[PDB]
Design a protein around this ligand. Sequence first.
Ligand SMILES: C[C@H](CCC(=O)O)[C@H]1CC[C@H]2[C@@H]3CC[C@@H]4C[C@H](OS(C)(=O)=O)CC[C@]4(C)[C@H]3CC[C@]12C
Lengths: 10, 237
Amino acid sequence: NHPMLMNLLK
Amino acid sequence: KLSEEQQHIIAILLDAHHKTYDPTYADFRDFRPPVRPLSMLPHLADLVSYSIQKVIGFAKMIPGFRDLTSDDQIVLLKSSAIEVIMLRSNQSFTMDDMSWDCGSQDYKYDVTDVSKAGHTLELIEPLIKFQVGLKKLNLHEEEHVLLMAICIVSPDRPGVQDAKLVEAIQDRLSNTLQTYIRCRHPPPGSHQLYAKMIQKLADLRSLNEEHSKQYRSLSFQPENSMKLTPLVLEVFG
Ligand SMILES: C[C@H](CCC(=O)O)[C@H]1CC[C@H]2[C@@H]3CC[C@@H]4C[C@H](OS(C)(=O)=O)CC[C@]4(C)[C@H]3CC[C@]12C
């Protein structure tokens, strides 16, 4: 549920 | 004796840290400026938000971390971020004047500065005592970066799915740290050093909890929330 965090991890 | 695998882990975490912690603090200029009530909140919110991004960059380069699910990566970083920020901050912390000295007087933060961002002494007094105890350990950079990586890859964090893989990754790191202390850390500095480092991880859980509590209070009031960043709002909730 954490779009920004996901983006930065990928 | 340090295995080949273990030496490689250390070299990678050192480079990962060098790539994500600028000891000239050049980027601090891009933050909303400091002001010496919630006067320091814009600056410190930006600082923390930036630091969150840097921690994510560090975490990504941890041996084994890539093998975790996306969801697991998310829950580890969400719960670890504040702790790793507090750990990594030890590098700028100086016991001379109990301050974070990030290159210049503009970016030199003392008890009163970091108290002007909505957080009370119930967090700051223990945070500062933490920084003192951690600084007295006189860690080698190798130990510092291992401790941050261990902190991120903790199997007990709330919401972790594949706890056994998280444990496996952490063990590799723990075993590296233990072996490194034995081989490369001279007595007396090395005396119970592993046990004292793991104790710092316990202290950080307590600091995280208190930070959470105060973040809820701070952020309950929309006019204060307004002053944060979208990343901070997402990570801390
Ligand atoms: C300046 C140093 C970092 C120096 C370095 O990296 O070398 C950092 C490390 C830990 C940080 C503190 C962590 C807890 C608090 C978070 C808060 O932020 S908030 C509203 O939740 O988003 C801002 C105030 C706050 C009290 C922070 C102030 C800035 C500190 C002290």
